[PDB]
Ligand binder design. Structure first.
Ligand SMILES: O=C(Nc1cncc2ccccc12)[C@@H]1CCOc2c(Cl)cc(Cl)cc21
Ligand SMILES: O=C(Nc1cncc2ccccc12)[C@@H]1CCOc2c(Cl)cc(Cl)cc21
Lengths: 305, 300
């Protein structure tokens, strides 16, 4: 019993975190094989950040300008190149702790673990979701850029996020490991704002299934709904549309609990229209949307890594 | 900016997780140097659960009865001893991944990260607090026994909890790494119940300071209170009493935000009286009590 926000074990990722210093800027790098990946803004100063020509800035750099430190050992940079918003620093040593890994780009609603780092040292691990507005509501202070988001599949780490910046509202923006930003953001000091966020409906339904699995069942009702009628109500309350794909992914949880997806949707519809009435679900007075259906199945079945 | 429930990076603990099998029971063990620590109930059968005599059961065991597996390698047990409710299995190999570590007994209100494991394999990591009733509200399934709670300060892992069991309400009970249970619990199937849980008041105040640091000010008010008046109100909402120690520990946060402890205390009394009125604090509609003052200063 129990349901917690649970991150993947971070060990395989901790063995890849290094410190990248370029001039006055120190941030984190991800050392995989003989390459160190980090945000390309490490090569910027004050003027550069306002209107940066990164290709021009990187051409003026040499390998010895990049100071890479793995633990207490200095790695020597033997090459540098840029792929979108990420800088790739070729080093003379392959990381002996390189795990089985992939670079994947995730979609909004998907969750991942963040290994927050400062000066190449992991300080914390937390679970979060890629919001529908492509920001993440993380916890990051100055020096955390280069911290990575990941999932673990069998014995394979899928790196899906690298932290780049904090938006004016306190939410965070970053890129996949190929340097492509999630969302309409840019790595430059300019006026940038996250779009109005919406609730991840499929994850709320998965979390209601996790609550039923844990014995919390007051919100269940006799009713069902059509997918279209539910989606009309979802739009009204800034909830993402629920697709047939989402209904199919919730199938195993529906079979396990005996509550059809559209039956759970009628529960959710009433929760939205009437509130919790002083009650809580899994110790929360709000509907939680940062647990995907796979997260609920993984946790409520004990899948290990 | 941002405030999240954050666990410590679990790598230093993952390298210590092993599988301990004794007869039909398989649970987790913590391999540090040449010793594997695990719950002593791994030596229990069906009729040795309501009233087991662990000293008598352990005397009947030999080293060859304990099957320890670290990854795909079988460790050879060369000695066994019991320290309170923990079993210590001396092995013929020191764990090369043994980090700098300490065994620490924590107090209620203190937080720690849990590395949930099954069959000696880490499946997830989450942040917990030792409840005032000495239980933890974890997320554990059958086979999670031996999973450990820890904190990391600098390079050193302080092991503070080993999971032993789930109570009838779904909450969890366990021991420190010297086998001493937290709370009035025993490692047997006898009738046991967690006492009525209360809210960790000092942790709620620390979390309100984290909210002010993050730009949330709506719950602030022009009032202050005496410590005694705050406790008389707080206790009526099943909140732990706030001691002078707690007021002192909140001093740095009070200095940083400019809001005196007793001023924050009056804001908390108001929050208890009115509820949140549709508003949230740090993305939560309830008062969060699993962030200590130390966690807030660290994360902010
Ligand atoms: O956002 C940035 N760093 C941070 C990242 N995460 C949490 C922070 C909390 C507090 C302060 C900084 C934080 C840097 C420095 C500010 O200016 C920029 C600009 Cl203009 C662009 C880019 Cl891509 C990065 C950055
Ligand atoms: O609770 C126990 N294991 C578990 C631990 N954590 C979460 C669980 C969730 C679901 C099922 C089992 C779980 C064991 C087996 C059952 O009975 C006992 C008794 Cl009577 C005493 C002791 Cl010390 C341990 C245990």
């Amino acid at each position: 019993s129990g349901f917690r926000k649970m991150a993947f074990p971070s060990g395989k990722v901790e063995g890849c975190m290094v410190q990248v210093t370029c001039g006055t800027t120190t941030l984190n790098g991800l050392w995989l094989d003989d390459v160190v990946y980090c945000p390309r803004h490490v090569i910027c100063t004050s003027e550069d950040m306002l209107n940066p020509n990164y290709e021009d800035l990187l051409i003026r750099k040499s390998n010895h300008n990049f100071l890479v430190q793995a633990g207490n050992v200095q790695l020597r940079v033997i090459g540098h190149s840029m792929q979108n918003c990420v800088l790739k620093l070729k080093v003379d040593t392959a990381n002996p702790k390189t795990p089985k890994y992939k670079f994947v780009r995730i979609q909004p609603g998907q969750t991942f673990s963040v290994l927050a780092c400062y000066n190449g040292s992991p300080s914390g691990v937390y679970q979060c979701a890629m919001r529908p507005n492509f920001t993440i509501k993380g916890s990051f202070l100055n020096g955390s850029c280069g911290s990575v988001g990941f999932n673990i599949d069998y014995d394979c780490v899928s790196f899906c996020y690298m932290h780049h910046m904090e938006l004016p509202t306190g939410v965070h923006a970053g890129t996949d490991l190929e340097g492509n930003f999630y969302g309409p953001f840019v790595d430059r000091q300019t006026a940038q704002a996250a779009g109005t966020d919406t609730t991840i409906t499929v994850n709320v339904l998965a979390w209601l299934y996790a609550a039923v699995i844990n014995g919390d069942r007051w919100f269940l009702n006799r009713f069902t709904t059509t997918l279209n009628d539910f989606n009309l109500v979802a739009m009204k309350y800034n909830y993402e549309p629920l697709t047939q794909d989402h209904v199919d992914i919730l199938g195993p949880l529906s079979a396990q609990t005996g509550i059809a997806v559209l039956d759970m949707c009628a529960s959710l519809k009433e929760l939205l229209q009437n509130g919790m009435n002083g009650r809580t679900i899994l110790g929360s007075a709000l509907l939680e949307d940062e647990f995907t259906p796979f997260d609920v199945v993984r946790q409520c079945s004990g899948v290990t890594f």
